[PDB]
Subunit: 364 residues, 3 copies
């Protein structure tokens, strides 16, 4: 296997785009939402835990998530990336690029949690939680879905992280809230940067600048647009008028919904997933810190289920694997969702409780 320089180029730019989602994307999104007196502290916590995730990732995170191990975790053979030669190829790109790309996905997941809870949580407590939860939740779930583990081996479809990123972080946020907008142009700016960066996430999940990356790119455009319109219509119906936060939340709803699906569906399915995600998102926030689950959880679940529908050739998808019915695939999607929810929840509980027993959760 020789690295393709076009794929190298594409994947490095895609990684920069995903990093852009956290720094400053998610930080600006939460920054406009939370109380003004908490903005600077939140921005600090997002920046510092971003740094921490990057370092934990290189030290042992990548090895435990993407090394060959068992159904649940990898190994400790790639500590500080030892035993990975610089010219080592993974797929069609240098493995180093796969390290950086996968690391940037861990970063956005943690940014979603920290941004939402920074208001309510002590600094030292969030650092402890991050270490526990990144190590015992994100890493095993990344391994199970993308590292050849339990879920991948049963044929779970999750292109860019409906489970690993969105459901995963939404449950940690929900456990957080349970245990513990002044600048709308800022929220919009955050949303926009999130949208643009997300193309690196969705298309880059192909691992190559091929027709699947192209598909995921177009689907991302279609599903985000459909979700904005879906949310806004429901908002006009329920509330009498659209709002900027509505439009922005709609965009995020479509982006989340299409994340597990983008590389498997036709543009028709993307339009349908978008509309359903936008509406489900609006229902979610109507019926949870900064509506993390309300959108990332609900729309993550919706998207992961609908992938099991719209991957069908019949519906314009790339097709299920050989010998797989829609019936069987839907069940596998449901099982993957359930596993992610319980795994994240249990680990998150452990994380917050360890923090609470050590330094105390609630901010003095």
């Amino acid at each position: 296997a020789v690295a393709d320089k076009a794929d190298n180029a594409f994947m490095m730019i895609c990684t920069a785009l995903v990093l852009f989602m956290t720094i400053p994307g998610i930080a600006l999104f939460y920054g406009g939402l939370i109380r003004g007196k908490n903005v600077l502290s939140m921005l600090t916590q997002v920046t510092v835990t971003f740094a921490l995730v990057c370092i934990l990732w290189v030290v042992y995170g990548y090895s435990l998530a993407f090394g060959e191990g068992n159904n649940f975790f990898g190994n400790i053979n790639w500590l500080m990336l030892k035993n990975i030669e610089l010219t080592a190829v993974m797929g069609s790109i240098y493995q180093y690029i796969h390290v950086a790309f996968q690391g940037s996905a861990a970063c956005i997941t943690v940014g979603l949690i920290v941004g939402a809870l920074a208001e309510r949580i002590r600094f030292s407590a969030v650092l402890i939680f991050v270490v526990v939860w990144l190590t015992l939740s994100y890493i095993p779930i990344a391994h199970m879905v993308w590292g050849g583990g339990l879920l991948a081996s049963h044929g779970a479809l999750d292109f860019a992280g409906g489970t690993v990123v969105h459901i995963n972080a939404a449950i940690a946020g929900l456990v957080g809230a349970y245990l513990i907008p002044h600048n709308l142009p800022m929220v919009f700016t955050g949303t926009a940067i999130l949208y643009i960066g997300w193309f690196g996430a969705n298309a880059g999940s192909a691992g190559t600048a091929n027709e699947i990356a192209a598909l995921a790119f177009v689907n991302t455009v279609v599903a985000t647009a459909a979700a904005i319109l879906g949310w806004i219509f429901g908002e006009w119906a329920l509330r009498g008028k659209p709002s900027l936060l509505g439009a922005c939340s709609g965009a995020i709803a479509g982006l989340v919904g299409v994340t597990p699906a983008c590389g498997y569906i036709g543009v028709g399915g993307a339009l349908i997933i978008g509309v359903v995600a936008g509406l489900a998102g609006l229902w979610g926030v109507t019926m949870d810190p900064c509506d993390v689950f309300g959108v990332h959880g609900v729309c993550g679940i919706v998207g992961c289920i609908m992938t099991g529908i719209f991957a069908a050739s019949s519906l314009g998808g790339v097709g299920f694997a050989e010998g797989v019915t829609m019936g069987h695939q839907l069940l596998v999607q449901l099982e993957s969702i359930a596993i992610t929810i319980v795994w994240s929840g249990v680990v998150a509980f452990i994380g917050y409780k360890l923090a609470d027993l050590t330094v105390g959760l609630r901010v003095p």
Copy 2:
């Protein structure tokens, strides 16, 4: 024809850059200019009509603009992109990428109009106008210039949309104004994002990461810089001192001027076009909602004419087509400008009037 993965990579990143121009680029630019009480509504309208354009584009927009039809429009064979196979190649890239790239150009055009007029126009009215004008103005003009239609067949030179994007949207904005800055750091931020995104527009118009993309890239840098300096000097001459809005408007003036020309001229012509566009822009705003025509119209016309001059090998350009004199080419540029102006104006009038007859134009 097989897709080149380097071109795939380049074109997908260029499309993300052009989307970045609208979301949040143009929105932030207008956001700093308009009255504070109108900012949130404008940002909502730009986001929602952005979503609408994306969807109309996939449903039928691309097919009617880039399908084979007549001199004026394509066909309805690529509805929801039906009959385009995933692995279908257009030029040296997957056709799906050409869909996304061309869609992002439609989006920035509509963003230029909506951002400027959102203050004055009712929400439902702008949605109706967008549908009419995207369908009957942007699509036929994109087809005439870039889809093998009337203007392309007579040899019109317009690399990245001096007519299709800038003159087109400037006339719609001017008809709009006729019928119907509190945050300068925000305007600057919008301008900057517009500048960076524009490289995807200008260089990506090559359809490939070749020496023409490289040329258009350098020309974009040169012409923007020359236009900033030209505007600022004229401002110092006329007003006694430069201003931030002046500098920013200068940048936009150069970017617009070089849009039709970037892929056809030498760096010497780029410098000359930049200076002339910057000065013409300043004259334009001195002698129109948020100066849409003042800069996009004037500098679009200036750039489209000057392309007919500086494409000459004599002047460092790539050369006119075989059998074409500068005399003949200039006439073709003038005719393309005239056609765009009258086509956009007539359709825009129809659009606003339909909106006015249906829901009423003026915001209650």
Copy 3:
């Protein structure tokens, strides 16, 4: 030599990223720091001198920096890029792209100076200084380090501009200060854009999307993260609590430290350089306009020295050149630092004094 389209694509996107660092990156960073009454003027000066650098670069800057001449400067053979054919290849990319990439590095260097001093300096004076200093400092130093001149021929290691960009601009800023935060979310936004853009600077310095670009990318992620954590820990130790400006300054400290090193070291060295740069940065600002030298100077020196250590195969680096000991290489790094400091200082003194003798330095 034929151009590789993947490298063309990668290098054009990397150039856009580096331009993004100045416009709006550095402008927003200084914008949040300086007094509110000075923000608009500063943003204007950064924009106008950015335009000026771009134009001076094309007219003669690139030719004098990268043309073949002597140990100190190139030639005047590539005036307005004359004698460079469009299809001319430099390395594995079109030479035009090398022009744009190298130009964008000159731009960020000047942006670092102008942003810091715009408060204190008259508009006409900064324009004169820029012309003198770009011409007599940046150009010869770029030639000496990257254009086959004095320092490159003695084997100086400087991958992405620890000397050419950071030490160079830090000394000009320090001479400036000697002769002559209201928006922290803005500073953070500036910092973030600086971080994302810097990947184009560091990885693009490979000139190709290969394993060295991949290395420099990962090292950039590691060193920035380590520097944030290093600064924050020292801040918690010295001041009792982290701060947003601390976190942001830490990020910049790591980015600067790793700039000369990124393409030569292992991830272990990147982690060590990051921590040491973050701490040295904090010492620097504790023990100078907008702490330009405090971070860019101190961390530039630290990074340039440490490159001479961690390039060793023994320490996970790519290895010293044949026949070079760590002892000999460290000396060459020290000599390169010393030369840059004295060269920049002397030229900067000349520049400011010429400005002072012509229009007067201090702003009326």
